[PDB]
């Protein structure tokens, strides 16, 4: 029914620790696999940490908060999600100071919040800048996601696809350098071909099918008209349908239906465009006038899709077709191609101009390959987005967590009070990241982790991480595990904030 007292905070630990203990071995390139039993007897062997916790039914409420926060992390960054839950579970894994020591939660919460500002300032000291003009340096960065995949052969092509696409969407004049993949970077798939044939289309491609055989197949200078309203007989303010039981009245309603549709379509063809793009649907009587003009009929195009077309060919959005002016034209468009590609109808408005957006064309032999190439380029574009926002890299392979753990230990000597004990626990909680990398490789954990702490004490903390494949110690200047700083900052801010949120709840009450 409900829980109260120390059992809530002690229960929230076991709930968050149990969820974390599953994916502990899912981190790293050597990460172990898992087995899920379907209710019908099926088996899913996927090692992806996002798919595992998605199919697991969790009873405890705090266990749901661990999953919902990880799902939000996937939207912003498609990497490092597993590291968030491991750190969020390890920081809460030490219950000694929580209960046995009889310390008040706010005393411990103040320790994490002070340790959070120190973990952020340490990463900026050990970071390194990046030259975004050279595409060779961006190649080894993206290869982190490309490795152990089937696109490794086309990896050289996969880099140019994600790099040039994000650079177009990035608008640096505003000062915030905002990049939106879910709109301007929108991707569609093309059946047929091979992986090499995949290129980056400059423009906005529409998947609308060809309804009638009369359309413009190829145009040197396309003309595009953008208007929101649908082409139909004008109705009343309500949705009430028109019911006519008399034949004489049918001729009165049909004449009004043919007159208004022909009137709006007459003002559209006055400019003589090559296509008509409407936001809503298009009736059958309206398509009869569109096929007579020998122009392409396009409908069901959202607002964001229309905003990109207006900046591409120079179009203009008008509320009603009767108000269309000469300002709406498609002048400047490269070509218009309705030609069938891969047994599917495509539309190319592509041009020589950069309307803060583009379209990615995915070629492939089968739909199984298309699904593999798609998801592999998605996170690769997010890697390009995270680097262009903060062009700074931090050493990976566990070198970043150990470099911060050494700074927290040295600073705790000057801290005087009861908060020094939980403040040092954060330094030992960051060692779980290099620990799982060694355990998955098979090498001894205690022997290597002890010698690793001696390297950051003497040598520079920017190097000497942990090799995941081999298992020994290697510098990060000689290896490509360098990771973007924007990912590590979001990881530590989320791991600490989630651990604080669960400690603040001392009672679970059921009611509405």
């Amino acid at each position: 029914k409900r829980e109260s007292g120390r059992k809530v905070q002690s229960g929230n630990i076991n709930a968050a620790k149990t969820i974390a203990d599953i994916i502990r071995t899912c981190l790293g390139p050597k990460s172990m696999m898992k087995m899920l039993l379907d209710p019908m007897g099926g088996i899913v062997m996927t090692n992806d940490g996002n798919a595992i916790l998605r199919e697991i039914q969790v009873q405890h409420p705090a266990a749901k908060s661990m999953i919902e926060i990880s799902r939000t992390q996937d939207e912003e960054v498609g990497d490092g999600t597993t590291s968030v839950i491991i750190l969020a579970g390890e920081m809460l894994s030490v219950a000694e100071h929580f209960l046995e020591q009889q310390m008040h939660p706010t005393v411990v919460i103040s320790a994490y919040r002070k340790a959070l500002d120190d973990m952020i300032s340490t990463l900026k000291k050990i970071s390194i800048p990046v030259d975004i003009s050279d595409s060779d340096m961006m190649l080894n960065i993206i290869n982190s996601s490309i490795t152990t995949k089937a696109i490794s052969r086309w990896s050289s092509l996969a880099c140019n696809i994600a790099l040039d696409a994000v650079k177009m969407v990035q608008f640096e004049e505003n000062g915030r350098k905002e990049i939106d993949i879910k709109k301007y970077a929108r991707v569609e798939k093309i059946p047929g071909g091979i992986i090499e044939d995949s290129c980056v289309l400059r423009g906005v491609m529409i998947n609308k099918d060809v309804t009638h055989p009369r359309m413009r197949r190829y145009i040197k200078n396309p003309r595009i008209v953008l208007l929101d309203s649908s082409l139909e007989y004008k109705k009343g303010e309500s949705q009430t349908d028109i019911e006519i039981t008399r034949e004489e009245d049918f001729t009165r309603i049909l004449q009004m239906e043919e007159e208004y549709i022909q009137q709006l379509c007459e003002d559209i063809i006055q400019l003589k465009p090559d296509v008509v793009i409407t936001e809503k649907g298009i009736s059958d009587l309206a398509q009869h006038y569109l096929m007579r003009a020998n122009i392409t009929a396009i409908r069901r195009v959202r607002k964001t899709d229309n905003n990109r077309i207006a900046r591409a060919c120079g179009a203009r959005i008008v509320s009603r077709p009767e108000e269309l002016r000469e300002d709406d034209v498609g002048t400047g468009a490269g070509l218009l191609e309705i030609k069938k590609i891969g047994d599917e109808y495509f539309t190319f408005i592509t041009d020589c101009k950069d309307p803060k957006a583009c379209t990615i064309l995915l070629r492939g032999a089968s739909k199984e390959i298309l699904s593999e190439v798609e998801r592999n380029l998605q996170d690769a574009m997010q890697v390009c987005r995270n680097v262009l926002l903060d062009p700074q890299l931090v050493p990976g392979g566990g070198a970043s967590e150990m470099a911060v753990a050494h700074a927290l230990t040295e600073k705790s000597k000057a801290m005087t009070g009861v908060e020094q004990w939980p403040y040092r626990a954060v330094a030992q909680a960051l060692e779980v990241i290099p620990r799982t990398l060694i355990q998955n490789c098979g090498a001894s954990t205690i022997r290597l982790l002890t010698s690793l702490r001696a390297k950051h004490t003497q040598e520079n903390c920017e190097t000497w991480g942990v090799n995941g494949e081999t298992g020994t110690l290697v510098d990060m200047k000689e290896l490509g595990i360098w990771e973007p700083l924007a990912v590590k900052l979001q990881t530590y801010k989320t791991a600490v904030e989630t651990a604080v949120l669960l400690l603040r709840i001392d009672d679970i009450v059921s009611g509405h």
Partner: protein, 521 residues
């Protein structure tokens, strides 16, 4: 430590469950390996009995109760789709890899190190297979040895020699001048009321529905083939009209008016017969797929035509390529250019039905393999043995290299791995040692099914050594080491190559499963 209505195994016991699943499946399918092996019975529950030694059938069709063993059943499905053979030896190797690795895992060795040993041993065994294969040209004498080796396992060693000449001759005719070979060029048919030893070749195609009329010619020496999709039965009005009748008799009078469109088209068939080769010692055949009115059957029967109706789609497809007749959807376009040519056409009468033989053709690019058996399940067992024999000869002609059989290659690969020092990790040799002893399960199982000792048979074949190349194998009858190349025991190269890739990937993923969790179950 788990959520309600579910179960999880945190410790290594989750790995022990998967190992016990492979060992249980290994003991079931080890008795059917080799010709001396036994047979498994398939009971569908409705009273149907099926008997076959094929590993792909005993897995894909039979549903396994244990969840983990069902994954291996799906692997043999993709295994048979590529090579077509080796599904039984595939499971036996996977079971031994997990068994030998269990000895080292119980000592505290991490599974990842063992999996790295399999990858290093797979490349060494794959490069050693390069020197074993023989590049000799494929001729009739070699294809017989390949056919006998594949058939002897799926039959009683009786129909072997009967089915040997049927499989070899069917492949040689459909491939000339290094042309890509397709098994869809060969048709499989089944007849009842005959002994199982009556299986023979069919040069043409076997048709289901024959001709019905007392005057139909039982055999026609020469004739032309006219392909038609048109139905000669009763049809509605072709032009624009309706049913106007004052009584039941007037409605039947419009029937003769609607039939006039078809009856005039029936005369066009008679006209074309007399225009092109309408003299003596000639004939004409109607392969028309749709039905034909009985009255139209009488008009065509008096001219010496053998009518056909109510055919299938696959029949008309092969009759188009074999005979050469162009599909004609309307008789107004009827022309002699769409006529084909065929040899002796006769209908062999069975104890029940009658089938049509189009045989004696020049280059039809199609043949048929006719199977005869006393029962239904006997026909199913032979049909599986033929397709398994066709893919064995197809892979032997496509890939000009063949490897010795009778466990000669598996023993030869095990010796090179032991003498091979680790090229990657010092502790990776334990995986190589486990993979080396796993390749020895093939000659061991052949000794059990033959009724001999497992140890004495393996020691003799391993004791064979010389300066030059020496490849020996397990002899089922004698038991002494026997050279498989001299006695005509050969296997396909793509089969042995695919086992090394398949047994390595599947046995690796089983060792990579850390925990078993229940989702929604």
């Amino acid at each position: 430590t788990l959520n309600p209505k579910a179960e999880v195994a945190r410790a290594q016991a989750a790995l022990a469950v998967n190992i016990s699943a492979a060992r249980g499946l290994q003991d079931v399918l080890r008795t059917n390996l080799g010709p001396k092996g036994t047979m498994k019975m398939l009971v569908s529950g409705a009273g149907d009995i099926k008997l076959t030694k094929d590993g792909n059938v005993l897995l894909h069709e039979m549903q396994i109760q244990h969840p983990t063993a069902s994954l291996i059943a799906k692997v043999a499905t993709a295994q048979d789709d590529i090579t077509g053979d080796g599904t039984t030896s595939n499971v036996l190797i996977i079971g031994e890899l997990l068994k030998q690795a269990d000895l080292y895992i119980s000592e505290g060795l991490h599974p990842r190190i063992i999996t790295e040993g399999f990858e290093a041993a797979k490349e060494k065994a794959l490069q050693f297979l390069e020197e074993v294969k023989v590049s000799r040209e494929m001729d009739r004498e070699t294809l017989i040895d390949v056919a006998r080796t594949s058939l002897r396992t799926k039959v009683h060693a009786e129909l072997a020699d009967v089915l040997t000449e049927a499989v070899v001759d069917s492949i040689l005719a459909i491939k000339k001048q290094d042309e890509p070979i397709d098994l869809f060029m060969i048709e499989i048919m089944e007849m009842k009321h005959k002994s199982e030893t009556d299986t023979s070749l069919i040069r043409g195609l076997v048709l289901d529905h024959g001709a019905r009329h007392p005057d139909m010619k039982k055999r026609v020496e020469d004739a032309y083939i006219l392909t038609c999709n048109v139905s000669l039965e009763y049809e509605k009005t072709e032009v624009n009209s309706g049913f106007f009748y004052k009584s039941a008799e007037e409605r039947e009078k419009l029937v003769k008016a609607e039939r006039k469109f078809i009856e005039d088209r029936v005369k066009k068939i008679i006209e074309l017969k007399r225009k092109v080769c309408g003299d003596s010692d000639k004939g004409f055949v109607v392969i028309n797929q749709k039905g034909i009115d009985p009255f139209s059957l009488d008009a065509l029967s008096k001219e010496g035509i053998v009518a056909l109706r109510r055919a299938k789609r696959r029949n008309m497809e092969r009759l188009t390529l074999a005979c050469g007749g162009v599909a004609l959807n309307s008789f107004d376009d009827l022309s002699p250019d769409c006529l084909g040519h065929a040899g002796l056409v006769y209908e062999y009468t069975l104890g029940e039905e009658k089938f049509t033989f189009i045989e004696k053709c020049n280059n039809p690019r199609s043949v048929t393999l006719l199977i005869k058996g006393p029962n239904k399940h006997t026909l199913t067992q032979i049909k599986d043995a033929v397709r398994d024999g066709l893919r064995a000869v197809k892979n032997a002609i496509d890939d000009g290299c063949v490897v010795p059989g009778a466990g000669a290659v598996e023993v030869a690969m095990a010796e090179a791995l032991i003498k091979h020092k680790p090229s990657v990790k010092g502790r990776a040799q334990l995986g190589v040692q486990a993979f080396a002893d796993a390749l020895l399960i093939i000659p061991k199982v052949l000794a059990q099914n033959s009724g001999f000792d497992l140890q004495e048979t393996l020691v003799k074949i391993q004791a064979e050594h010389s300066e030059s190349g020496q490849l020996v194998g397990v002899d089922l009858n004698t038991g002494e080491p026997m050279v498989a190349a001299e006695v005509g025991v050969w296997d396909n190269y793509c089969v042995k190559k695919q086992l090394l890739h398949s047994c390595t990937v599947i046995a690796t993923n089983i060792l990579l499963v850390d925990e078993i969790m229940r989702a929604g179950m």
